[PDB]
């Protein structure tokens, strides 16, 4: 997927200069794995993930349920970070992130801005903003929202 | 609007720090003027405005015609900002909208990520990311995507 026309240089994934962003950028390269066993030591205890504004996981349990039941149905072939930056204790990525239905096959492009909440390195809270209008076929689990 | 558990007092809107987080919480406060003609007035000639992933208005021409018809079908009852932030010139907010269609008189709450990029104090870009899957009812418009 190429790179769209609004986007900043200065702004870039590659401009990484906190350790926050460059932590976050990491965990965005290993989602790629489907493992939410991997995934989830990127994560503290408190902590929570939010795929608005459906239900939102509370604790690390919680969370590593979430994407492990995610990763039963979907696979994440790809993420491309546009813009990485931060601000006041909190990280912005604005990417695409490429999806693909298990029991279809079917793969499907969901534009998203996510906020990170970082404390000593692990993530205490990551909330993805996107249009769910796909997110329902795409993912063969109940949205409950 | 209830502030949400995630909420940090370090990123909240009253807490705005910079020239461009200060402009982009007036252009927040203006939105529930529904007045495409006070809007545009926020904006760059070189601009672009996107309810991701819909098809974008590029030019300001183009953003105060969909401001204008979007005003026709909906008003926009309430902004709560929770999170303003900026990094690397863009600036963003984590809000919801309070929606209200004008045919019915539903209410929809939207939770929203948004990036805006200034130039000299005008908005170059827009972008705000949020689920859809009520925005198709909500709006009396034909979505394009």
Redesign the interface.
């Known amino acids: 997927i190429e790179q769209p026309?609004?986007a900043?240089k200065?702004?870039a994934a590659g401009?990484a200069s906190t350790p926050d962003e460059k932590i976050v950028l990491e965990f965005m390269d290993a989602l790629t794995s489907n493992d939410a066993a991997k995934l989830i030591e990127y994560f503290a205890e408190d902590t929570?993930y939010q795929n608005?504004?459906l239900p939102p996981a509370?604790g690390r349990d919680a969370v590593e349920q979430t994407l492990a039941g995610f990763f039963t149905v979907v696979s994440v072939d790809a993420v491309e970070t546009f813009?990485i930056?931060?601000?006041?204790?909190?990280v912005?990525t604005?990417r695409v992130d490429v999806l693909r239905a298990l029991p279809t096959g079917k793969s499907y492009?969901f534009?998203?801005?996510?906020?990170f909440?970082l404390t000593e390195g692990k993530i205490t809270?990551w909330?993805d903003?996107?249009?769910?209008?796909e997110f329902?076929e795409a993912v063969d689990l109940p949205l409950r929202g």
């Open positions: 026309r609004w900043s200065d702004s401009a929570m608005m504004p509370y813009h930056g931060s601000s006041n204790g909190l912005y604005e492009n534009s998203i801005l996510g906020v909440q809270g909330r903003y996107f249009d769910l209008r329902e």
